[PDB]
Amino acid sequence: GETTDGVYRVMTRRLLGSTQVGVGVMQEGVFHTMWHVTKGAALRSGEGRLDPYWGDVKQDLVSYCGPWKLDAAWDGLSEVQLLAVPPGERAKNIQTLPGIFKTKDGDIGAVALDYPAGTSGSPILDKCGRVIGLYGNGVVIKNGSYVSAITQGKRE
Amino acid sequence: DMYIERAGDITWEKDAEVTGNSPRLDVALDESGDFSLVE
Ligand SMILES: CS(=O)(=O)c1ccc(N2CCNCC2)cc1NC(=O)c1cccc2ncccc12
């Protein structure tokens, strides 16, 4: 398969035509996406197959071919970029200062950017280019605008 | 059945488009992995 690092689309043929159900991140030979994108199902990459290795419905994350690799975190201070991959449109960087989700379990960065559902799994970047989390699990606010958590997993 | 297609390199782009605000929101996370607005 295409094991090369970088951002990828997640496509299905099970709906009308070719539908993009979301996005993921390939890093150190491991594919990272949100759980709700695949629901833990196997993926094709050319001839190559990708089998799920790790996931958790509550963190809404899944990894393929190996353990979660992304360990960078938001410093709580600096702007970041959503590397957004909308359906049928080119990868496009958007820069923003994250807001905050305050929870009984501590605080998480949040990005207030509206995109189609099929953008779920687009990576969020720090200034050194490191992935600090995936976009597309969050909430809808007073405006009717979307706010995503910066969702990040753990590395062993 | 689902498949993957490469979309780009993961890089910071100088003079990316800058937008979005920074709300501070109280949220709950349920066992299904769904956030909801606490108020
Ligand atoms: C519709 S979806 O297939 O993307 C999806 C499926 C399922 C779920 N959740 C995740 C937690 N445990 C399972 C349930 C979330 C999502 N995403 C969204 O609904 C969404 C993604 C981007 C942007 C948005 N903007 C506004 C509202 C919504 C969104």
Residue A55 tokens, joined: 């996931």
Indicate the residue type of A104. K
Structural domains in chain A, CATH included, are 6-64 (2.40.10.120), 80-149 (2.40.10.10)
> CA-CA distance, A13 to A57, in Å (whole number)?
24
A105 touches chain B (CB under 8 A): yes
Sequence-distant (6+) residues with CB within 8 A of B6 are A2, A4, A6, A7, A8, A26
> Within 10 Å of residue A32's Cβ, how many Cβ atoms?
25
CB of A150 closer than 8 Å to CB of A49 = no
Nearest alpha carbon to residue A99 among A90, A109, A91: A109
> CA-CA distance, A139 to A3, in Å (whole number)?
33
CB of A153 closer than 8 Å to CB of A70 = yes
> CA-CA distance, A2 to B16, in Å (whole number)?
27
Please list every residue in chain A whose beta carbon sits closer than 8 Å to the beta carbon of residue B11: 93, 125, 129
Question: Which backbone phi and psi does A52 adopt, to 5 degrees?
Answer: -65, 145
Compute, in angstroms, the gap from residue A115 CA to the centroid of ligand 1: 11
Please state the separation of Cα A76 from the chain's center in Å: 19
Which residue pairs, CB below 8 angstroms and at least 24 apart, start in A148-151?
A148/A110, A148/A111, A148/A113, A149/A101, A149/A108, A149/A109, A149/A110, A149/B35, A150/A74, A150/A80, A150/A98, A150/A108, A150/A109, A150/A110, A150/A111, A150/A124, A151/A34, A151/A59, A151/A60, A151/A61, A151/A108
Structural determination approach = X-ray
Expressed in Å, this structure's resolution amounts to 1.9
Return the residue in A96, A132, A151 with the most chain B beta carbons within 10 A, the one to mutate for interface testing. A96
Checking chain A for breaks where C and the next N are over 2.5 Å apart, the residues before them are none
> CA-CA distance, A21 to A130, in Å (whole number)?
24
Nearest alpha carbon to residue A62 among A10, A108, A98: A10
Checking chain B for breaks where C and the next N are over 2.5 Å apart, the residues before them are none
Strand A43-45 with A48-50, pairing: antiparallel
> CA-CA distance, A105 to A20, in Å (whole number)?
33
Beta bridge mates, A8? A24, B6
CB of B13 closer than 8 Å to CB of A81 = yes
CB contact under 8 A, A44 and B32: no
Q: How many helices and strands in chain A, by DSSP H and E?
A: 1, 15
Q: CA distances (Å), B19 to each of A56, A122, B38, in order?
A: 31, 17, 26
> CA-CA distance, A72 to A112, in Å (whole number)?
20
Question: Which backbone phi and psi does A101 adopt, to 5 degrees?
Answer: -95, 110
CB contact under 8 A, B10 and A83: yes
| DSSP-derived secondary structure letter, B32 | T
**Alpha helices in chain A, H assignment, sequence order:** 35-38
Beta bridge mates, A96? A80
